[PDB]
């Protein structure tokens, strides 16, 4: 239901990726974040009755997990991409892919612990 709704939302709002990185690898890496997690969770957490207990915990080790996965991504858009120059759109399009990889194993992985 709609509680549930703000309390995800509300935690989605606190992940930080560092504003300072290129504006189109941020782009990127929010889209990401957006499309795989936070607009299947929110679809699924809608449905709840508003009596049904969501797992705070659940979605705080995603969150945990977010940031990690987003600081592989980033190492392998920039210092650590190996085929190009770092920040060029061949890195950041050479590492995306298992990037959303990454998240989409993370939601399946969520799913399962959303319902107290
Ligand atoms: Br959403
Ligand atoms: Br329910």
């Known amino acids: ?3 549930h709704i703000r309390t995800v939302l509300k935690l989605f709002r606190t992940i930080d990726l560092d ?5 189109f690898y941020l782009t990127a890496a929010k889209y990401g ?11 699924i957490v809608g449905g709840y009755l508003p009596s049904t ?3 705070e ?19 392998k858009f920039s210092y650590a991409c190996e085929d190009h ?7 950041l399009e050479d590492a995306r892919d298992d990037y959303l990889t990454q998240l989409v194993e993370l939601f399946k992985e969520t799913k399962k612990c959303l319902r107290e």
């Open 85 to 91: 120059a770092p920040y060029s759109v061949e890195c």
């Open 57 to 75: 915990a659940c979605v705080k080790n995603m969150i945990s997990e977010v940031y990690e996965i987003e600081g592989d991504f980033y190492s």
């Open 1 to 3: 239901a709609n509680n």
């Open 53 to 55: 207990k969501l797992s």
């Open 19 to 23: 504003d300072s990185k290129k504006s």
């Open 33 to 43: 974040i957006q499309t795989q997690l936070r607009e299947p969770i929110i679809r």
